[PDB]
């Protein structure tokens, strides 16, 4: 294989560190940049201070979209090979959609998109697609049962035939954990928490991806919770509908019932944060993992409920020890923005390899 | 690094099979296998039906113990280089151990294996102890918060002194995986089910063992799981003594209960399925696997406890695929067996390193 290309992404890179941090010969490196550097791929220079060379990528040899799917909204993000966003937008999708309506709203954002690359001389490369649930990764179809109107659909090819470009199909949960390896510069291990419509995982170990053998992983949304009555799904319980709906009961604006202060208010918070703590605890004493962070709807809750989240793990933890939560702050769309990395990554480790 | 090491161990295996299926020189193998076929640690020998030779380990070139530690007893293996038993025993301990009395059955073991390589004209090289709960296996510490009469001790270390030898400290479960892994001779994914006295897991993906961040990975043990009246652990539940004890209670032996054809046993069954298949979804949901394997207590149950399981795990799973439950059928002792192969490679890796 390769994939010093997964390395010169990582950052700009001399010939000598990749032969020494990876580990090959100076002529095997040697030949390789000359492919890279010969496709327009990469680009030499001289460091900002004897003197020495760095690899990095070019930005002009690919640009590539990346589409998150929600049940309300479709957002996309246009990037370049250097992972600078060219453009980002939304668009909202009608009360309960048809998979006709949805598939309108998508081709749009991606006719949008491959104008818009024309109409600037160059193209638009490869394509990578967000939905919730378990996925097909390498036929391109959206398993999730649930009522989806892009479920059981041949996503990937119906979108390749109309566009003539590569296409993937990948779980929103784990484009969000890519988001933040590449927009915070991680290589460590880390779960990536979707909140707010849908809850789930994406789990990163040694700034790689972590996939299941049955196109998911990290799914956490399907824990067991007894709410006093009778069981349910930690999904059902965390829901950004089911959560403000009850607040219409409650009578309090969706923020305001924080500065209500009241102890009905703090005690409703207090369930969600314990709920949500049972998949949290399930996630770190089982992959052993130390880092957590929390993305979407649970963002407007703020510290007070990120604390709440912290003493419940901190309470039930096999032993006593560090474990850090914490809020992603990435400006949005952080998913469609971890999918047009996905794109890229898989669009040019294509490309390389013919 | 090497670990051409790993897979000489894995099976018999030619240096051009070396060089393509791993990836390196013919001059870089046939260098390495200067080495290792120098030291004594491997041969080469013609294929049983132009002519080709492989390399095997030797058997002779090292002897390793492992042991497994439990509340009740402690479990031994001897094995050389090609992973045979030479022997293995287990020595009970009395009620409620000591440190000073549960070590001392520990040395005794390791004395009478010291003892017997010794007089055979070899030596004892390594030893590696499997331990229940997180441990420390940088340092060799078991750091099990729970009463264990080893915990919070310089366990490896006094080994070290006391012997002259290389000595680990490792998860039993994880042990109890590395053993089905070599005894089975498999490279796919899997989670090895600790069950009697203690509940957890060891979790092995693409053929190696997975290991957390601190100490721990596969804590199902601590499982939260609502009775009716309050929430206990997985553990508390599924432990072999709160089962027979309360069978005490039934009226019924140990295993009479099952040939007593009640209905009360049935349901007794069902429970214990019931709560240790939310363990199972946990970790299929989670990590993603598809493959369960159980060891210990729950082996006596029987099929007719394994079919309970298996249904109520494709029942709540997250979709309709395929999940293959089965037990171990590994002759005992199964934790001190893959104790004893991880103080194999450890040792043989450590010994080509210098
Ligand atoms: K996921
Ligand atoms: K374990």
Redesign the pocket.
Known sequence: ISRILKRIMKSPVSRVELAEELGLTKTTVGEIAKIFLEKGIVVEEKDSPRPTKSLKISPNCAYVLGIEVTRDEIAACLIDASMNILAHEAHPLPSQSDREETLNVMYRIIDRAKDMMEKLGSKLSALTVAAPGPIDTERGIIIDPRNFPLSQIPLANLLKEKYGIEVWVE?D??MGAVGEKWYTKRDDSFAWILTGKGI????IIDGELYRGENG????IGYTRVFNGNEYVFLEDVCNENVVLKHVLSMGFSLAEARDSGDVRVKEYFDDIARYFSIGLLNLIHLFGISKIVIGGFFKELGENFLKKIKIEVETHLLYKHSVDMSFSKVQEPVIAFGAAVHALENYLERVTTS
């Not at 789930?200 to 789990?203: M, R, S, T, Y």
């Open positions: 779980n949960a784990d789930g995982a994406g789990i998911y992983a990290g799914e």
